[PDB]
Amino acid sequence: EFPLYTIPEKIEKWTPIDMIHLSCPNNLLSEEEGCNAESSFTYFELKSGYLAHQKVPGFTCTGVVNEAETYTNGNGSVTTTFKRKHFRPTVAACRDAYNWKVSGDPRYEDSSGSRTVTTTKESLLIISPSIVEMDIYGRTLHSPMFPSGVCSNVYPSVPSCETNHDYTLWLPEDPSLSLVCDIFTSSNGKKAMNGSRICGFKDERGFYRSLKGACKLTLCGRPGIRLFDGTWVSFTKPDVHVWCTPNQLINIHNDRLDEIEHLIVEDIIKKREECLDTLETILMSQSVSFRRLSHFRKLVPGYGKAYTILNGSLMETNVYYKRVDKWADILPSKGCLKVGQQCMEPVKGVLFNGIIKGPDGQILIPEMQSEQLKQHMDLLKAAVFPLRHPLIS
Ligand SMILES: *[C@@H]1O[C@H](CO)[C@@H](O)[C@H](O)[C@H]1NC(C)=O
Ligand SMILES: [Tb+3]
Ligand SMILES: [Tb+3]
Ligand SMILES: [Tb+3]
Ligand SMILES: [Tb+3]
Numbered sequence: 001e002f003p004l005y006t007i008p009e010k011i012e013k014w015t016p017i018d019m020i021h022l023s024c025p026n027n028l029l030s031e032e033e034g035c036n037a038e039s040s041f042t043y044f045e046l047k048s049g050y051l052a053h054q055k056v057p058g059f060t061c062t063g064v065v066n067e068a069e070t071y072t073n074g075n076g077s078v079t080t081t082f083k084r085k086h087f088r089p090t091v092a093a094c095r096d097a098y099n100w101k102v103s104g105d106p107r108y109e110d111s112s113g114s115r116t117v118t119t120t121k122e123s124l125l126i127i128s129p130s131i132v133e134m135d136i137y138g139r140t141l142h143s144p145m146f147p148s149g150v151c152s153n154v155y156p157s158v159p160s161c162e163t164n165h166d167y168t169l170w171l172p173e174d175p176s177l178s179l180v181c182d183i184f185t186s187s188n189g190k191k192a193m194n195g196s197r198i199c200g201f202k203d204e205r206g207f208y209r210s211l212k213g214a215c216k217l218t219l220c221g222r223p224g225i226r227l228f229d230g231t232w233v234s235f236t237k238p239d240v241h242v243w244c245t246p247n248q249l250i251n252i253h254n255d256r257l258d259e260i261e262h263l264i265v266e267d268i269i270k271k272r273e274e275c276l277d278t279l280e281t282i283l284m285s286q287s288v289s290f291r292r293l294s295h296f297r298k299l300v301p302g303y304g305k306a307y308t309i310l311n312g313s314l315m316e317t318n319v320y321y322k323r324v325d326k327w328a329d330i331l332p333s334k335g336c337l338k339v340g341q342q343c344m345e346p347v348k349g350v351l352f353n354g355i356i357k358g359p360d361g362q363i364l365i366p367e368m369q370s371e372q373l374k375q376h377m378d379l380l381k382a383a384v385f386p387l388r389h390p391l392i393s
């Protein structure tokens with residue numbers, strides 16, 4: 001991921017240069033892993049947002065029978081006594097009843113004598129839609145009408161789950177369970193490589209993730225891998241070799257993640273626009289103003305250049321760029337900028353990369369006062385809900 005800030009490991013030489021040697025950095029996260037090569041490829045991730053096929057459409061099926069004894073009371077009365085009781089359905093009956101219902105027909109649906117009793121016994125099955133949930137980590141099928149919370153059968157062969165009422169069974173709408181793990185999209189990403197080695201990818205939004213520390217995880221039949229940050233994707237030759245502890249969970253794929261991801265990626269773009277735009281006005285106004293060198297800082301860790309102005313001239317040195325995690329790790333004192341081991345003595349109020357000592361003695365870094373990439377980086381961290389197992393226990 002992107003750091004908050006970057007800072008030279010050490011600063012030694014400070015050689016001079018002309019404004020036409022100003023380079024804007026390309027900020028490739030994958031470079032710090034040693035992979036500067038980006039070839040397209042295609043990977044599987046969860047569908048975005050709602051997963052209509054983690055839910056399983058089905059129907060309860062209860063068997064009733066209504067008896068009606070129509071006796072003549074001997075008063076000359078004609079009296080009718082009703083009894084209602086239950087019975088247990090067979091799966092094949094329930095299916096035929098359901099199919100009968102989905103298309104209109106005749107669905108659901110007495111002589112006196114003087115001295116005869118008459119008993120009509122009607123044997124209905126009632127069919128109400130009932131949705132039940134599935135654990136995509138491993139195909140079991142949970143609901144609170146099932147007696148242990150878990151279906152009595154198990155994917156791919158569920159003729160019927162057993163419910164808590166001996167007279168009611170649950171059948172699934174599609175006895176095949178053929179749609180019931182279509183929860184995947186195929187997206188197009190850009191894989192970052194070094195010859196053969198695969199170090200990470202940018203997903204369909206442009207957001208880079210590293211493969212380092214990624215365990216293997218099979219989700220609802222498809223064997224993918226779990227990326228450190230928690231998200232899950234499957235593609236052909238992962239080079240991942242450590243199965244996950246079942247403790248581990250993946251994350252959902254909600255839309256605002258994908259949205260906020262895209263915000264991050266246009267943020268990286270806009271700093272690279274703003275660096276060329278600055279470097280243009282630098283060469284076409286032929287006036288370089290120290291405030292603005294801030295734009296040439298290598299946003300990613302790695303090797304690069306650093307820039308200042310002294311003795312009137314403009315000048316550079318070649319550095320390794322440490323990741324900076326907390327502002328306080330480089331600003332321990334007021335007025336102190338921790339480069340390597342000592343503070344950085346500013347000459348007539350300037351240090352490198354546009355960092356100055358303001359008139360109050362404080363070390364002003366422009367990125368520190370407002371950075372839209374950093375504010376967005378936090379929202380992403382906050383849109384990440386882990387996809388948990390079913391709660392029914
Ligand atoms: C691959 O890694 C080697 C070793 O550091 C490096 O010399 C080479 O430039 C790399 N190739 C890339 C990043 O395409
Ligand atoms: Tb080093
Ligand atoms: Tb009787
Ligand atoms: Tb929104
Ligand atoms: Tb929106």
Ligand SMILES: [Tb+3]
Nearest residue numbers: 273276277280
């Ligand atoms: Tb331009």
Ligand SMILES: [Tb+3]
Nearest residue numbers: 331332333334
């Ligand atoms: Tb301080």
